[PDB]
């Protein structure tokens, strides 16, 4: 490949430059949302974010070296996790709130608009406050998001992928070493970061069943792309 040659700083700069933009929701629409109204906005947003995620993935060092099938498998497995960690990262400077979009900042009470959504909201808000607690840096965030993309479906098939994962681990440690953290503080933070990924996986599966519940109940029509990503989880 070619991603294993990059330095830690070159890895950070590559990931930072590959970052997808912050998309907007449709303006308005007015006072409180109904179940169909809220899920409508979220579905539209998620579908558009998905398009940028796919182009972001191709700009993740080492990802393009993978076969077409492998790239598909990874994205099918991780897409909701990736959307979620993005959402959580955006909401960091907004405690008690979730920034789906700059014009769409929702609180816990607004999670009640849809049945069984407030539980997912709580898990997301908790993850956000955890990031805020750890004072998560942007350079650390882009490493974590890439790790999710490469790891989530890797056990569902690999030597090259794990080599890239190790490369990102080197990069994480590098950042912490630059921040002035001691050796002990380095493996402790690294561990703390990676353990959160287990919770992010948990939220995704809770969220996946929610979306599947929405399809069944036909609350709002899902896009063809979203359905294909959703159908991949049986």
């Amino acid at each position: 490949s070619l991603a294993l040659s990059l330095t830690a700083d070159q890895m950070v700069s590559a990931l930072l430059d590959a970052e997808p933009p912050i998309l907007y929701s449709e303006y308005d629409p007015t006072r409180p949302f109904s179940e169909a109204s809220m899920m409508g906005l979220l579905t539209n947003l998620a579908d558009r974010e998905l398009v940028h995620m796919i182009n972001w993935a191709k700009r993740v060092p080492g990802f393009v070296d993978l076969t077409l099938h492998d790239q598909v498998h990874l994205l099918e497995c991780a897409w909701l996790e990736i959307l979620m960690i993005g959402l959580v990262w955006r909401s960091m400077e907004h405690p008690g709130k979730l920034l789906f979009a700059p014009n769409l900042l929702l609180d816990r009470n607004q999670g009640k608009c849809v049945e069984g959504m407030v539980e997912i909201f709580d898990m997301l808000l908790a993850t956000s406050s955890r990031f805020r607690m750890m004072n998560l840096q942007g350079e650390e965030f882009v490493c974590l998001k890439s790790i999710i993309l490469l790891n989530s479906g890797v056990y569902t098939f690999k030597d090259h992928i794990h080599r890239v994962l190790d490369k990102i681990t080197d990069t994480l440690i590098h950042l912490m070493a630059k921040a002035g953290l001691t050796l002990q503080q380095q493996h402790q933070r690294l561990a703390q970061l990676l353990l959160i990924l287990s919770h992010i996986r948990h939220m995704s599966n809770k969220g996946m069943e929610h979306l599947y519940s929405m399809k069944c109940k036909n609350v709002v029509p899902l896009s063809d792309l979203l359905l294909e990503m959703l159908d991949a989880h049986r």
Binding site: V51, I54, N55, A57, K58, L68, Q71, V72, L75, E76, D224, L225, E228, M229
Partner: peptide, 10 residues
């Protein structure tokens, strides 16, 4: 057929 296939190639 998959939409994801197209977006990845494009």
């Amino acid at each position: 057929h998959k939409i994801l296939h197209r977006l990845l190639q494009d």
